Curated annotation (Swiss-Prot), chain A:
Keywords: Bacterial flagellum biogenesis, Chaperone, Cytoplasm, Translation regulation. One of its GO terms (biological process) is regulation of translation. This is Flagellar assembly factor FliW. Acts as an anti-CsrA protein, binds CsrA and prevents it from repressing translation of its target genes, one of which is flagellin. Binds to flagellin and participates in the assembly of the flagellum. HAMAP family: FliW (MF_01185). Interacts with translational regulator CsrA and flagellin(s). Belongs to the FliW family. The keyword Chaperone applies. InterPro entries: Flagellar_assembly_factor_FliW, Flagellar_assmbl_FliW_dom_sf. The gene is fliW. Pfam families: FliW (PF02623). One of its GO terms (cellular component) is cytoplasm.
Length: 148, 157
């Protein structure tokens, strides 16, 4: 047997998703604290683009990137509390994503490097982690490799 | 047969990256000459990543593993220009420049920053008439392996 769920998505209509892809956000996301479950929808293998889609609110879907594909010097320090919270035990567990603010033209799109999405897919746990002590920019130009 | 409906226009297709999807018949694009090296693939659907972004896949409706990763090249190369010959205009029943969408095939590399785009041979789609082709441009200096990302420093000091 399998465990599949039909999910209404913002950009792709209804998709069938394995249940083990359903990520619990026990604390939701800041300003969306009641949104306790999301699914990661990648664009295409080998690309750094994704959407983080609410499994309960079709119109809530964050366009995100793997920032490490765009910004060579970007690093994320995970606090112990975040590690506990997401049941992380090892480096390979962890996926980092960053929210786009998509602009017209697309070349002006920015990336929030202060507040990454952190997902432990293995344990189906996620959160948005707000970095306080950093000099990262909440509006880093997506197409400027060098950090502001 | 003992159950009637008006849902015959919705087609179920297996996609490379999104699983099984339902697609409206009016999204099915006829490629009457197929695509070069895939001349038997006469029907594709355009699957956009997300509104406001230039990323799409061009998915065969007959062959699950044939899905081209493509971009709107104008989002990356503002000065890009595509000349449709008179015969292409007729082939795709274009009756207005607003009918036309241009896409360019990616060659996705690892790391992604090394990805190239084919600027010599765009995908040309008339969505209103559901007709497409790939057109190899003549008499241009466009690069078939144009870097998608700018890694050079251009000086006009
Ligand atoms: K909810
Ligand atoms: Ni089971």
């Amino acid at each position: 047997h399998h465990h599949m769920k039909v999910i209404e998505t913002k950009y792709s209509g209804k998709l069938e998703v394995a249940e083990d892809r359903l990520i619990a956000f026990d604390q939701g996301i800041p300003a969306f604290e009641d949104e306790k479950e999301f699914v990661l929808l990648p664009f295409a293998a080998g690309t750094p683009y994704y959407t983080l889609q609410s499994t309960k609110t079709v119109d809530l879907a964050f366009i995100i990137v793997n920032p490490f594909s765009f910004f060579p010097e970007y690093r994320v320090k995970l606090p112990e509390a975040t590690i506990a919270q997401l049941n992380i035990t090892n480096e390979n567990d962890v996926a980092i994503f960053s929210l786009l603010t998509v602009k017209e033209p697309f070349s002006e799109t920015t990336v929030n490097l202060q507040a990454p999405i952190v997902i432990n897919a293995n344990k189906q746990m996620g959160k948005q982690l707000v970095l306080g002590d950093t000099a990262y920019n909440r509006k880093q130009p997506l197409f400027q490799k060098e950090l502001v």
